[PDB]
Structures are given as C-alpha cells and as structure tokens.
Write a protein that binds this ligand. Structure first.
Ligand SMILES: Nc1ncnc2c1ncn2[C@@H]1O[C@H](COP(=O)(O)OP(=O)(O)OP(=O)(O)O)[C@@H](O)[C@H]1O
Ligand SMILES: Nc1ncnc2c1ncn2[C@@H]1O[C@H](COP(=O)(O)OP(=O)(O)OP(=O)(O)O)[C@@H](O)[C@H]1O
Ligand SMILES: Nc1ncnc2c1ncn2[C@@H]1O[C@H](COP(=O)(O)OP(=O)(O)OP(=O)(O)O)[C@@H](O)[C@H]1O
Ligand SMILES: Nc1ncnc2c1ncn2[C@@H]1O[C@H](COP(=O)(O)OP(=O)(O)OP(=O)(O)O)[C@@H](O)[C@H]1O
Ligand SMILES: Nc1ncnc2c1ncn2[C@@H]1O[C@H](COP(=O)(O)OP(=O)(O)OP(=O)(O)O)[C@@H](O)[C@H]1O
Lengths: 362, 362, 362, 362, 362
DNA sequence: TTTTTTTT
C-alpha cells in the first residue's frame, strides 16, 4: 500500500521544519509503536509526542519506501514556499502578530505542568529589566511601533555607553522578540558585501560595537566601523531599495530593514547623528551588579537575555488594547494567569529588593 | 484523473509569476474551498481572489501530485520564455507603453473603491516634484524620448549636486517609471563583472553615487568609481554589443542599456564628460525642506520616490498626443478623472504652499 | 496523438534559432489559430507569419506536452551541431558567401513590400561612409580578402585616432558585415579565461579602445589592455590552436579568429606592433559633424554603423566579378535596382551635400 | 524497428570522431537519400561520401529518435576508451607509426585524383624548410628519436630566439607531425593546474613564448612564465605521475609527456636550464624573407607550417631503414612517387632559388 | 539474455582497474572471438589474454547494451570501496607488506620474460647504491623500520651535507618504496600554513633542503626555516594529532607523519637538534661521479633513484626473516634467481668498479 | 560538480 506524501507535508507544515535531514530523521522515529514509545511516555519533545500516534501508520510504510529523500524534498519545498508567499504579502503588523503567537506557544509549554520553567524566576527577570532603564516598558512599546511602521529616516536607534552597561543584553532580547540578525561593520570595505547579505528578508538587524576612530584618547580601541556606516546613508534612511548578495547566489533587491546600532563612547559625526531617531544612554549601576551576584539563577538560565522575558514585561504593563486584535484573547488569559500568580505587592517587593542591590527573592 | 499542466501555465502567465516558489506557494492556496476562502471573502489579494474559484478543482488534484516542483518549473519557463521573445521583438516604444499599461492598471486599484490611496496626497507630491527643477515635466518628456531613441553615444544623463539635493530621489522615480536596476561601481574590479551582470534585459540602469578621487578638497570621501567608469566607455557608448555574466551562468551578449549617473561634486575626465549627453545641477533649497517638514506624509508613504507620481505629473501636464496611440484612450479617461477631482486653483494653491514653505495642504 | 519532434527540429533549422528559451517562446505562439493570428495579419515578424500555418497543428499538441524543454533542447542541439559541422568543413569563402545571402535576404525584407526602410536614407549613409576615408570601398575589399585568406601572423588591423574619430563606427559596421564578436581585454587577467571563451567558432573579433599606457601625458588613464594583449601574441599570430573555455564545459581547441583592434593613441610594444599587418589613422573632421547634426536620422536609425550599409557600398562600387559566383545573380539584381532608384546625379547631389556639411538631403 | 547504436558507434570509431556535437551533425546528414546526395556526387568530404550509402537506413531511423544525444555520448565514449587503452598498452614507437599512417592516408588523398594540393608546391616547401637550418631532416630525426626514447631530464628542448625568427614555424610543423598539444604557461598557477589537465593522453606538448624577466632590458615584459616553469620541474624532468584535472569528470594520474618550450631572450634560472638536452634557436636569414615575399602560396596554403611538409622531407632525405619497420612498404612506395615526379635538378633549382631569396617556381 | 553486471565487477576487482574509461575500453576488446584473438596469440598483455576466453560471451552481450557506462561506473565504485575499506582497516605493517608485493611484481615485470629492464643493469644500480656510503642496506633497513613503527619523537633523521651529495636522490627512491612527499619550509609563516597541508594522509614525508635562517654566518643563504622548525615542536614529535590546511579547503586533523630533513651544513639550535634521532652528512664522491659518468645506463632506465633498485639491494643483503612473513616466499624465489644469475664475483667486480669509479659493467 | 569563493 502507498505512502501518503500529503501526511508528510502536513507534518512538515505543522512543525514548520525546513531542513530535509531534520524532517527525515524525526519522521522515521514514528515507525515504532507510539503505544510503547518512551519519548511519548516521557513527554520529552512536543514535536514528537503530539504527532507520533497520528503519523505512526504512514511512518511504517514510509520506512519501506525507496524514495525517502524525494518525499522529504517536496515536503520541505512546501514549507519554504509558504515562507516566501508570506514575505511578499503580509503586513509588518501581521508578521509581528505571528511572531508573538510563536512565543506564546513556547510559554504555554514552559510554564505548563510539564513546564520546567519557574514563572516566579522569570518574573524576577522582568523586575531586573524594568530597572535597567527609566520607563522601560514604554521604551519597548515605542521601539516596536517604530519597527512596525518602518517610516523612512525615522528608522534607527542608537545605544551608547561603556563596557558592561547592558546594551548587548537588551539588543539580544529585542532581537529574539522580533527576529533578526547581528552584523559586524568593523570589517574592511571589501568583505562588507557578503556581510550585509545576512540581512536578506530579515525583520531587524543589529550592528555590534561600531568602533570609532580616536576614542583611543579614552582607551577605546579604534577601527573602521563609523566610517563604514557614514558611507551607507541610504541603507539607514531606508527610503529606496538596495541590492544584496549571498555566497553562490545572485543578488536580490529590497528595502534594507530597520535596526539598532551599539557603541562605546566614541565621537559621532553629525552626518551620522542625523540618521538616528533616538539615542539611549546605558550607565553601569552597582546595585544591579550586587543584585546579579546574589540572584545568579537569572544569568544561569539566561532569563535576562530572552525575548520571552520582554514579552512578559509587555503583558504585565501594557493595556490589552495595545495588542493586535486577534491575540488580545490570549493576552487576557495570560494577564489573568499572572494576576492570579502574583499580587502587586509581591512584584513591587521584588523591585524594592533590586533597588537595594539585595537578592531578588525573599 | 490527472493534473492539467496547462491550467498551471495559464495561472503563471496571467500572474506573470517567475519565481518557482512563489508560484508553488500561491497555487497551493487554491486547494481549500474558495467558497470559504477568507482571503477571497476579505478581497485581500487580487492574484488570489480573482483566480481561486477558477483553479480550485485542478489545485486539489495538484495537491496530491508527486511531481509538484517539475510542474512549476515548466510553468515558470514559459513566463521567462515570453520575456525573452519580447526582448528581441518589441520596439522600445512598445515596451514603454506596456510598462505604462501596468502602472495604469496599478493606479486603477490604488485609487479604486478598494483603493487605500488618497489621490489628493499623491497629487500633492506632483506639486513638490514640479518645484524641484525648472520645467520639470518637459525634462521628464525629454528623458523618456532619449531612452526610447537610445541613440549611440547620446545615451546618458549626469546628475550633480551636494548631498540632500534630491538627485537619488528623482532617479528612484524614473527607475520605477521605466523599470530597470541600480548599480554600484565603487568597487574592486574583480567583483565588478558579476555586478554589471545585473543589467541583463533591463531597460534603464542607474549608477548610484559614483565616488571620485581628490574630492576631499570639497570634503568628499574618495573611491574607485570615476576611474573605474572610464574603463567602461563602450558600455556607455552602446555602439556595440557586450558580454554579461551571472553566477553559474555562461555569458549573455547584448547592448548595454541607457541610464543615469549620480554623484556629488567631484571633477571628471572629459573622456567621460564626452559620454554624457546632458548634465543637471541640483541645489538644496530651504522652502522645499521647510515645506517637507510640514508635509511628512509625503515621505511616510514614499510618494516622492515613486514612479506613479511621475506618471500622474505627465498625465496632468502633457498633451494626449504625446502618448502612443493605444494608451491614449486610457490617458483621456484619467485626464477626465483628474480634472473632475481638481481645479487648477487647488493645484495652484498647493504649489503656492510649497513655494511659501508652509505644509502643502491648507 | 503525439508531438513530432522532427517538425520542431525543422523549425529550429529554418529559423537558425539557437536559444532554447527563444525557441520555446516562439513555438508556443503557434498554438493559437493562425486563422486569426493578429501577428500574421499585421505581418510583423517573418519568423512567425511564414511558419505559423504550417506548425499550428503540431504546436497544439506541443502545448499539452510535459517534456517541453527536452524537445526544445534536442532541437537547439541540432542547430548547434550544424554550426560545428559547417565551421569544420566550409572554406572561409563559402562561409562569407552564406553570410552575404543572409544579409541580402534581410535587405529583401527591409526594402520589400513591407518596406520599412527608405533606400534613400540608407544610400545617404553610403555616401557618408565613402567620405569617411579615401578610397573607402577599396579598403573594405582589402579587409575582406585579408579575413578570408587568414594568412598567419598577417591577421590583424589596428585603428588609431582620437575620440570621435569614427574608428568604432567603422569597426561596428564591419563586425556586423562578417559576423563576429567584440571582446574586452582591459580586464583582470584571470577572467580572460571565460571572456575569450566567447570567440569559439567565430569568424572575426574586435577589441575595444584597448587601454594602454604612456598616454597619461595626454589624459589617457592606463590599464591592463596593452599589457594583456602583448601576452596573447600566439592568439594573434594564429600559427597554432589554443584552448577555449566555457562554464560547465570542457575546453575546445581551435585556431583563433582574425580581426581588428581600436586605439586611442596609447603606446604599443614593438613585439605587438610586429603583428598588425596594417594600421589606419582616423581624424575628426568638423564638416561631417555638421552634416550629422542636420542629418540625425542617420544616427537614430543607426544607419552609418550597420554592415547593411557597407554591403550597399560594395554593390555600388565593385565589379560583379569580385563576388563569389553563386551570388553574382543576386548582386546583378541589386545593381539594377540601385541604378533604377538612383541616378548618379542624385548620388552626386548627396555626396556634395556631405562635403558641404549641410543636411545630406535637399 | 529501432536505432542500431552499434552502427552509430562503428562510424564514430572509423571517423575517430570524438566530439559529440560533430558526430551528431555528421550522422544526421545521412538521413537523406544518398542516391542524389550532392556531397557524394561532389566527392566533397571523405568522412561523408564513403559512409552515406552504408548508414542511410540506420540514419533514417536515428533521425526520428528521441535519445539522439545519449546515443552519441555512448559512441564518443567508445572512441575515448579506445584512445585510453592504446595510451597505456602501446610503445612510443607503435604510437608514432600509427600517427604516420594517418598522415600518409591524407597525402594519398591530397595528391590523389582530387589532388587538390600539388606536390611541386609542397616540394618547394620542403626546399624552404631544409634551407631554414642545416641538415634539417637530420635534426628532425634526432628530435623524433629523443621523443620516442623519452629519457628523463632529457625530455625537453628549448628555443630562446628573437621574434619572427621562425621557432614557432618549426614548433608548429613538429607538433602537427607528432599530434601533441600546445599549452600556455603565462597564467595564475591557481588555474594553470586545470589547463595542464589537457596533457592527458598526449604524445608531446609545446609551451608558448613564456614570459620570463630581465628581457625587460630589451622591452620583453616580465611575468608568470619563468616562475611557473622553474616550479614544475617534475613535469620538465618527467619524474613521476601527476593526477591531471578534468571538468565534471575524474582527474587522472599519469606521467606527463615530453615537449618543447619557446621564448625570446628572457632570463632562465639555471635550476631550470638544467632540464634540457638542446637549448638552441635560430635567427633571421633575410633572403628567405624575399623568397616568401615572392612565393606567397607557401604561406597562404600554410605549407611551411604543416607537418606534412616534414614528412615529405623525411621521405626524401632519410633511408628507408630509418623508419619503423611496418610502414617501410609505404615509405618505398612514396619514395617512388617523389622520384617519379621530380628530378634532383628540379629540387636543386627550387633550393637555389630559395637560397637566393627569389621566387621559386620559375 | 542479459549482461551479467557481476562478471564485469569481477574483472575490475581482479585487474584492480579503477578508471571507468579503461575498464570500458578493455572489456569491449573481449567482444571478438577469443578463439582467434590475435592479442591472445601474441601474448601481449595478461590483463587481456588471461581473461578474454572467460569473459567472451558476456562481452558480446555487453557490446549490444545501451547502458554501458553505467555498468562500468558501478564496477569502478566496487574497487574504490575496497581500497577505502582497507585504507581504514589495516596496519602500517600490512600496508607496507602490500607495497612490497606491488614492487616485487614490478620486478616480476621488469625481469620477466621481456627483460626490458636488464636485471644486470639493475644489478649495476644495486652496486652503485651499496657503494654509495657506509653499510647502506642496513641504514635502509633501520630507517625503514623506524618509519614503520612511527614511534613518537623517534621519527626524524637529519640529512646534512653539501650540494649534489645525493640526499635528495635517495629520499626519492624510498618514496617510491612507500609513497609520501617532500616539503618546503623556507618561507614566512603565511606560506607555511598552506604548505603544511601537503603532508596530509602521507605514509611518509621529507623536507626539502632547509635554507636555514642563521646559516648565512656560514655564508649559506637562507630563509625562515630554522626558526620555523624550531617553533614547530609537536609536528616532529608526532605525540598528538595536529591540524592541517589547504587553499579553498577546510582543515583536517591527523598525527603528522614521520620523515627526513635535508640541509647543507646549516646552523642549528640545540632545541631543534634534540628533535632528531640521527645526524648524517652526505658528500659528493669522485669515484661515484666519474662512475655514473661512465655508467649512465643507470640513469637511462631510471635505475639509481628507483625504489626497485633498493628492493633488489635488500633482497640481496637482507635475510628472508627480515621480510614480511608470507612475502618471504617471494624473497626466497628472488634470492634463488639473483644468486643463480650473479656470482658474488660479478657483484664484487661491479662493486669494485664503482670503488675504482670506473664503468660498472666491465 | 562547477562554480564561486577563496586567495591575493
Ligand atoms: N546597567 C548595568 N550595571 C551594571 N552591570 C551591568 C549593567 N548591565 C549589564 N551589566 C553586567 O554587564 C554584563 C554584560 O552585559 P552586556 O553584554 O549587555 O553589556 P554591554 O555594555 O552591552 O557590553 P559590550 O559593549 O561589551 O558588549 C552583564 O552580564 C551584567 O553582568
Ligand atoms: N533640493 C532639495 N532641497 C532641500 N532638501 C532636499 C532637496 N532634495 C532632497 N531634500 C531632502 O533630502 C532628503 C534626501 O534626498 P536625496 O536622498 O534624494 O538626496 P541626494 O542629495 O540626491 O542624495 P545622494 O546623492 O546621497 O543619493 C530628501 O528626503 C529631502 O528630505
Ligand atoms: N571623422 C569624424 N569626424 C567627425 N565626427 C566624427 C568622426 N567619426 C565619428 N564622428 C562622430 O563621433 C561619434 C563617435 O564615433 P566613434 O565612436 O566611431 O569614434 P571613436 O574614435 O572610435 O571613439 P572612442 O575612442 O570614444 O570609441 C560618431 O557617432 C560621430 O557622431
Ligand atoms: N630565418 C628567417 N629568415 C627570414 N624570415 C624569417 C626567418 N625566421 C622567421 N622568419 C619570419 O618570421 C615569421 C614568423 O615566424 P615565427 O612565428 O615562427 O617566429 P618566432 O621566432 O617563433 O616569433 P615570435 O616569438 O614572435 O612568435 C615567419 O613567417 C617568417 O616570415
Ligand atoms: N655522493 C655522490 N657523488 C657523486 N654524484 C652524486 C652523489 N650523490 C648524488 N650524485 C649525483 O648528483 C645528482 C644530484 O644528487 P642529489 O640531488 O641527490 O644531491 P643533494 O645533496 O640532495 O643536492 P642539493 O643539496 O643540491 O639539493 C644525483 O642525481 C646523482 O646523479
């Protein structure tokens, strides 16, 4: 009897898998009886245990096929095709709404009964991030709106301050929240071509550590990044399309995505200042350092790195109307859960502890 | 029963799709019942909702096919083949009229009932453009004729001005009007061959912001572009065919298309000055800036960059006789629609606002 | 019922088509009923309307086929095979005799009933070229003999003169006449591998304004041209076969075609001077410039740079016996037609106008 | 019925055709009735007219096939396989006597009833060649034996002489005689590696006018030649096997063939100079120039380049016993034909005219 | 009836053929009746005549196959797979055992019934070899077993002594017995990086004459080699795996093979000295130079640098027990031959002639 | 697999 290529393609769509080998390997695991399957019983991986019982019959026949990689290629093509349709048709608001739904699904697992995470430790994360800058939650909301509208010239934000000011932490969490890539412009001009190629079809980009020149007056090591950026005015202003390249691929043409620039305290040309909507200053604060010393489960579990943490911050702080209408129903349910799990007193006690530089938990 | 490859080829032809993935992903959407298709019901994408009901039955059988990518490959070849045939057989005038017919079709949507655009905002853009240079509409007509005639050694226009003088803004609109590609020649000579490969079958090209050398006298940064360009005289001259290269592809041979060069105020070898038929200065002007500050919906919606804006300018200013015969019927209808919606006093009020540096509207 | 691959192959032979996409595109057009084919009715393209009615029946079945690119590939291979057989077995004189028949067929169309070309404008071009150098028609006959005889190390003609001397204009018309390729050697020395690979099976080649050195004294900025050419002395000399490369293709070994090099007046090593059997000096002459200004239809229709114009010159000036026997019949008919449609006094009126620098016509 | 791939492969073997396009084109000619075949009637090409009648029936069925290139690919591989088997199993003497049989077969045609060449002209070529250097036949006999005995570090001879001093003229004739390949050194080693791949299964090679250094004192521009030569000492010695490259096909390990190198008077490292038995070149004899200038059919028909002229020279000069045994029958047969058609006085008359530098065929 | 793919695969295994073209060509030869087969009658090649009669029936059907190259590709894979299994599985001792068997077969070739390598010229080579320096057969046996054991640190010998001293000559012969390569180090570090990759997968290696920096105090001209090697601590010791690299290719990781260093009388750091098991110095000798001058047949049939000339030297001197335990059979059989063929007096006469520096084959 | 990338 025949293999159903359709059931494979459906699994690939549902897992959103787009590596042929990863797709292949996982489907083969279903060939053993789901009824006895230790991976099912131990509830180890949702992309397995949700699916094993459904695909078992087809996996058994798949295991005898002689066409195995051919089946997988067509399946993976279907997933890649769906992505490109979406890229050309969705609004940036819908893109972000989809991205949020993905994170919310991961949170449902993380804090589920199977969930290994501790919602209390993750709320301790939110308390620390809310102390990193004044009006942190309002600042995030502004950044997101700026990315969604993608208004030309009004596109780019500058993070400034010394080593261990925290700027890379916040960049990483934002980059996880929205999706995107880091880029390093400190290179010589020739390699920048493939470097910028990374930006193709991304939502955000982040420029790391754009080294100035002459900051060595204050021990900052000098480099070319600032000059290179000043030579990229149209990529930043985003008013017109640019060509982009990848290794072994022909060029594509698109609006270069919005993003973030990060630096230590180099001097900035006025030509470059004009490019930026907003500059945010990061300054070392000892009470955060002493708090982290006593609350290091934050670092160990990478809580303060994660977009998941920022999403919890938005859920706790923002009015429901601020979210895209479709997901507002899920947001209410999470707000309800958090209101059940914590009183404001509990949360504010944590904020006080952080201000003391004491460990977050008491 | 079996897949009709013919119906897929029709869909590719009618959508003018030439990406195999986009074609695939699009066609797969039709497999669900159009009668419930929310994309149809919400009238979100014409390249969907026009076609779903027609293609539905074949899409269901296509969803079961084991050959899916081969079927799409043949369809995409047919669309590519038609472009090839046209490149060798249309007059340059006919090409331009086809291109115009497509923009006019897009304008029909944008200002339709489903049309989101405000014709008053788009007409405001024409006022700002007609201020950017003396006799602006005459300049556009002269450029269009030059591009149609494609007279050898009389093929290229040079734009000069300081930064923020509007040259790349104007180049963008012409390029969207005619269709074509931008190119960057401030490069090492080795990559340059794959760079020039982009010009294949294009109508225009634009060489963007070519760097001279010694312009640091004027504080200009310096680079290869001008010296690199003087090695390419025959590409400008267009008197003879040249050979063009793409990655993993053997060379094509054709005449290199006509176009535009933009730069800040470097000096130039007259071996290259001889190649330019015309040179246009651009100058910063305060009232444009002050007007634009109070008119930022122009920038937010990219109106000022977009070829639709130049087409609207021509329809307003130029006689019907100057358009090629077949489109004169549509041109007449659009002229009637514009005149119905705008008095000369309204248009002159807008122009007077721009001159005064108030926001365009009042 | 099934596709005749034989009928397709025959059309590719008939058209001498050798791009698979161009072949595919044009054969598809025959699917619609020739009974109403607007292209046929408008008599626009010979390669269509001559063939549509014959191929229509087979094109309808081709339109359904699943193999389409494969059928086209075999047809293109048959045309390519015919070219290789010919290149290995014809005398160079027969090759040229065939080329002349193809041009004469095009002239029969151009000045035929459809008659898109005015023979008066075309003859005005002949007067302009015959004025460009002394004894012009004698010089063309010398060049043809040289290319036919292909005497080793007596194989190349050098054109020198300042900008707008007309050297490219003459080279362009000659290249069209014989059929051949232009090539750029002002290039990085590695990429020459695939560049020169284009010369496979060609009859004649041209190198462009080849960037030398020493001319910096006169603002000729220098480059790899003369450097590279003084390497390839064997390619010029043609005493031995050389290996030529294409992408995804193993090398072809053959003797390298004769031809022409063009030069603004850089310096040349005498190892290279030894290899040009002849050099011609070209000079700007204002009265030609004044003539062109008033006679711009020459440039706009590209008349003066077409081998069609050179063929008309030879028909006017040379004895019938100088042509190969099989075409002497066609030559006689065109001599008669020319004598009918022009008196000598008209041609003398034209040539006088050219000398005066006024508009050629009066 | 169906195509006999066997009959196709026989033709490929008997033509020794080893290009798939050439073979394809050739065989398709046979599809017409040979009984009226104009080429047969003309006796135009032996590789056609000998075979048309035999292959006609199979060619008709071949003309309808859908596998045509695949059939030709298998046939071509049979021919290459035969070459590869000979390339290892035969002695260098056995190879050479095969080569001579092929040339003798051409001469039988060239002076045959078609007789398109006249042995008197070719004899005048012999006279010019034997006049070019003393005892030319004897120095050739030395070179032949050296190449058969193939002694390492003694596998190569050089010419270092001036331009237009004939070294290429002689190399061409020897290379035609031996059936080697020319190769080009003057390249980046990072691609020369592939070019050397052509040396697979060759009797002999020649390296061309290789760019040294220090020749700059006499305007010879320096380059990669000297560098790449003194690098490849293994190949120059003939020390060991090398894995020679091919595209889309495996590389092959085999020992490199012996050869010749030409240059003008560049530097040569003594580390290189060690590797050559003879390092000898020859310099202009102006009277010969005046002879050529009055005997130009010699050059026009390329007689003095062609290995056929050398073979005629050895037939005249050498003892029958100096040839390999089996061909000595044919050697005697041709010695008869020379002595039948020429007196010594005629040959001497040619040779004094040559030495006098005058036109020869008085 | 049908081609047995099995029989084709047997022949490939038995011949150890691993080029698809050779396999194809040779197997096709069997298609003629073996009963008359003149290659069999002449006993030209065992790879033919040993097999033809067995394979004949299958070869006939093979010649009619339409699939031929596909059969051969699978057969060649079988032989390559066999090598890769053994290459991974077996010991250095087993591998040398087989390398002996190969070279003992080349003795069975060279001194088989054709004797085209004269066993006694090869004895004169053995004489010149053993006369070269002290105790040479033992010095070989020692160095050989040293390289078989590959014991850490105990892995490198230093061949000092001047130009033409023979050190290069001998290493080449041992490399014939085992494979391997020589290596440069005389360069700045960026060169060394890629150069070190040459050692990858070598069963043995050597270093080219180290022009040691700091040898110029001895007036020995130099490059960086001494400081290079003195820094390369591990590579010599072979204590642990190291990484190796090539142009355009990824890194590989392996224990760096053992070997030899060659130099003239250069300066050495005592650290670098500690890396070597033996210090040796070679010198040119007046008897030996005048002997080869008088005995050049040893150069002509490639003897003195041949590994077989070492193999014969070992079969002469070394007892059967010193050879691989089963190959010892062949050792006895060649001992029988050589001891029968040559008296010790002719061997001693030959050695004495070398001791007189006079021609060996008196 | 070639190519492009890499290497320069
Ligand atoms: N505001 C802060 N005050 C004190 N310590 C901080 C602060 N922010 C971050 N840290 C400490 O700095 C460490 C590194 O943080 P992060 O990488 O975000 O800093 P950064 O300023 O972006 O650094 P860099 O510029 O070097 O990448 C954190 O793990 C934390 O220990
Ligand atoms: N003539 C002008 N006078 C004043 N402001 C101008 C003028 N032209 C453009 N602007 C302002 O400058 C911005 C940038 O315009 P644009 O990018 O076309 O300038 P440019 O000088 O042509 O740039 P570049 O040469 O770098 O491509 C516009 O969006 C507008 O805000
Ligand atoms: N002899 C001439 N006298 C005056 N004008 C000329 C002459 N020859 C050409 N022209 C003008 O010069 C233009 C360019 O001619 P052409 O390209 O053949 O010259 P060129 O010397 O080969 O130039 P370049 O070095 O730029 O390639 C022609 O289109 C014509 O307008
Ligand atoms: N000895 C000679 N006497 C007179 N003319 C000669 C002589 N040798 C060569 N020539 C002339 O030189 C022409 C070119 O010869 P050839 O190409 O063989 O020389 P070459 O030394 O190899 O030159 P190059 O290195 O420049 O290619 C010959 O066709 C002939 O006209
Ligand atoms: N000891 C010797 N006495 C005389 N001739 C020798 C001796 N050794 C080698 N030869 C001859 O000299 C040639 C070169 O020897 P070889 O290259 O092995 O010496 P080398 O000492 O390694 O030289 P170099 O240090 O110059 O690279 C050999 O091929 C052989 O013909």
């Amino acid at each position: 009897k025949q293999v159903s290529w359709k059931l494979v393609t459906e699994y690939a769509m549902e897992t959103k898998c787009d590596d042929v080998l990863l797709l292949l390997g996982m489907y083969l695991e279903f060939q053993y009886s789901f009824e006895m399957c230790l991976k099912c019983i131990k509830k180890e991986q949702p992309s397995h245990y949700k699916y094993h019982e459904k695909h078992y019959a087809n996996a058994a026949i798949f295991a005898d096929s002689k066409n195995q990689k051919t089946i997988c290629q067509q399946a993976v093509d279907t997933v890649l095709a769906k992505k490109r349709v979406d890229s050309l048709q969705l609004t940036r608001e819908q893109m972000l709404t989809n991205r949020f739904n993905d994170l919310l699904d991961r949170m449902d697992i993380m804090f589920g009964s199977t969930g290994s995470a501790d919602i209390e430790e993750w709320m301790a994360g939110v308390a620390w991030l809310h102390c990193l800058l004044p009006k942190m939650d309002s600042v995030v909301y502004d950044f997101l709106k700026c990315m969604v509208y993608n208004i030309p010239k009004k596109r780019y934000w500058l993070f400034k301050g010394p080593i261990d000011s925290g700027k890379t932490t916040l960049a990483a969490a934002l980059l996880e929240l929205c999706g995107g890539k880091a880029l390093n412009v400190n290179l010589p001009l020739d390699r920048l071509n493939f470097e910028l190629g990374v930006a193709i079809d991304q939502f955000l980009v982040v420029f790391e550590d754009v080294k100035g020149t002459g900051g060595e007056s204050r021990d900052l090591p000098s480099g070319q990044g600032i000059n290179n950026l000043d030579n990229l005015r149209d990529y930043l202003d985003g008013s017109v399309k640019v060509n982009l390249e990848k290794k072994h691929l022909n060029k594509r043409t698109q609006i270069f995505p919005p993003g973030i620039v990060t630096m230590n305290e180099y001097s900035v040309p006025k030509t470059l200042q004009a490019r930026f909507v907003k500059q945010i200053d990061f300054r070392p604060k000892d009470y955060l350092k002493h708090c982290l010393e006593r609350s290091e489960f934050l670092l160990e579990k990478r809580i303060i790195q994660s977009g998941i943490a920022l999403l919890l911050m938005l859920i706790w702080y923002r009015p429901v109307a601020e979210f895209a209408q479709s997901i507002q129903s899920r947001i209410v349910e999470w707000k309800e859960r958090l209101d059940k799990e914590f009183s404001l007193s509990v949360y504010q006690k944590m904020k006080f502890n952080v201000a003391m530089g004491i460990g977050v938990l008491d």
